[PDB]
């Protein structure tokens, strides 16, 4: 199984920051055997953080893609599930998938949240956090947080959570426009 | 197809920077499905840009991969194509597969059409002579060149911001990232 | 397309500053010339299990040592024992190993040998905290110790200056590697 989950190529504004249809994420997740490949990337298009400078608070917003256990996404989502399927050769676009539990990160890998010191639960390890840049500009970096499986909203089986902020003090306004990151994970099957 | 296309993974001097062949630039693209996994290094062993220090500028280069509608790599390219091939010296006629894609990643009123400017780069620090106190950066871009009248791109644009006044050899730690491919 | 690995559970499997002091997470997956790996350590005990800007030196090694069938050696801070393929102890993995052609052992301008292209260097995050970097470094096939054919270290350190301390707990690291066949 080499397939690739992606939101599909519909150029509409796909993804909710902080109201219906104000961003377009995109994201590809490519099955490696027990590892996933994956590619992100954000434009906000309409609303609070379209356009970002040191004014807007808080510099941090949340895109959860909550799934359930067939690994199927589910409508409490950000990301709107008209855009996220299988990517194909044929003719896929009316058709919904109906499992997906290999593209899903491992809960033994990354468990939900729930005295010996050999036993300590890591916090960093279900979380994957790095640079990105807006526009690409080496000189407006940004952040992204990825976490598997730290949701519990809508009984979701698994999830993966973006987190994207900045730190960095912007006195012009530049739109929230994010180079693409790299990441990969170990996959429930 | 798993196949990887690269540069071999010991090349000698393939690539300009500033003159024909004063870099060896290591790039390997693994075809995983749709997506491609890339690992990227690059050396300069001449010129300007072979040992670097605060007096140099600019502090910022590009290197071109050109690509035609097949895949094959155009001769405009900083990248010489000679051992530029499959693993496996016939030259390859195609590798459309390894492209980015250019519906993710297309060429360059309604806020609901604004376009992504910053999905077709990657922008990371690297580290010369892999020191934790030598940072500087690579920006990989998709097909965001049109000179030869290319179908698909691939840029590395290299650099650091970093004061050195102790010189070092522009000298990279490898660099991982991955792309939407075209098919 | 197999995948070797620590198991993605370990117990306290590695040698930071004494025997399985951390829990070092590690998957390496083949794909085909390439293999896609992600890393990321807990330290449990010790010296480093929470760190803090009084704690000298702020980094060290975890060195994985391969025989010429790509076997780990016990002289590797990572212990053995469940180090394997995922579902008997493997008997080779030479496709896992780092190419010694694009990663030389260390040992005319034109003939300069690379000393960046063999490390891998990035941010982590303690806690995944993006107020909290530290720093890893993935080297390849720069180790000599007990006669290995080839080695993946990760270094892991940090510079930012902590003065409440803070647990080494690293977010995840994903990186890929030419392999040697
Ligand atoms: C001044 O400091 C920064 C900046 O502009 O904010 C830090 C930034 O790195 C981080 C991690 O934010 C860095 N970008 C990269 C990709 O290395 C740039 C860059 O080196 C210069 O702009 C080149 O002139 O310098
Ligand atoms: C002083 O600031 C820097 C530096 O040397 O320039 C910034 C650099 O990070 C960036 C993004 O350039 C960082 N390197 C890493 C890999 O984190 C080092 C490092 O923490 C110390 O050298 C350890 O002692 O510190
Ligand atoms: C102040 O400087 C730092 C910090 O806290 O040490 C640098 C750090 O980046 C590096 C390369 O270490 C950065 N983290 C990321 C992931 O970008 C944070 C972050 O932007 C703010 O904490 C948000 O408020 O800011």
């Given at each position: 199984?080499?397939?690739?989950?992606?939101?599909?190529?519909?150029?509409?504004?796909?993804?909710?920051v902080?109201?219906?249809?104000?961003?377009?994420?995109?994201?590809?997740?490519?099955?490696?055997?027990?590892?996933?490949?994956?590619?992100?990337?954000?434009?906000?298009?309409?609303?609070?953080?379209?356009?970002?400078?040191?004014?807007?608070?808080?510099?941090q917003?949340?895109?959860?893609?909550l799934?359930?256990?067939?690994?199927?996404?589910?409508?409490?989502?950000?990301?709107?599930?008209?855009?996220?399927?299988?990517?194909?050769?044929?003719?896929?676009?009316?058709?919904?998938?109906?499992?997906?539990?290999?593209?899903?990160?491992?809960?033994?890998?990354?468990?939900?949240?729930?005295?010996?010191?050999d036993?300590?639960?890591?916090?960093?390890?279900?979380k994957?956090?790095?640079?990105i840049?807006?526009?690409?500009?080496?000189?407006?970096?940004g952040?992204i947080?990825?976490?598997?499986?730290?949701?519990?909203?809508?009984?979701?089986?698994?999830?993966?959570?973006?987190?994207?902020?900045?730190?960095?003090?912007?006195?012009?306004?530049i739109?929230?426009?994010?180079?693409?990151?790299?990441?990969?994970?170990?996959?429930?099957?």
């Open positions: 199984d080499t397939r690739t989950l992606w939101t599909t190529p519909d150029p509409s504004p796909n993804c909710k902080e109201t219906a249809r104000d961003s377009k994420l995109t994201l590809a997740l490519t099955k490696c055997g027990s590892q996933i490949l994956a590619t992100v990337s954000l434009l906000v298009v309409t609303g609070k953080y379209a356009i970002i400078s040191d004014t807007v608070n808080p510099k917003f949340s895109i959860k893609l799934f359930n256990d067939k690994g199927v996404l589910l409508s409490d989502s950000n990301l709107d599930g008209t855009y996220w399927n299988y990517r194909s050769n044929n003719n896929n676009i009316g058709t919904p998938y109906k499992e997906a539990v290999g593209f899903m990160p491992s809960t033994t890998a990354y468990p939900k949240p729930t005295t010996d010191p036993k300590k639960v890591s916090q960093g390890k279900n994957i956090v790095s640079n840049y807006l526009g690409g500009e080496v000189y407006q970096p952040f947080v990825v976490k598997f499986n730290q949701e519990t909203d809508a009984n979701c089986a698994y999830s993966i959570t973006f987190d994207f902020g900045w730190g960095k003090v912007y006195k012009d306004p739109p929230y426009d994010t180079s693409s990151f790299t990441f990969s994970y170990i996959a429930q099957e």
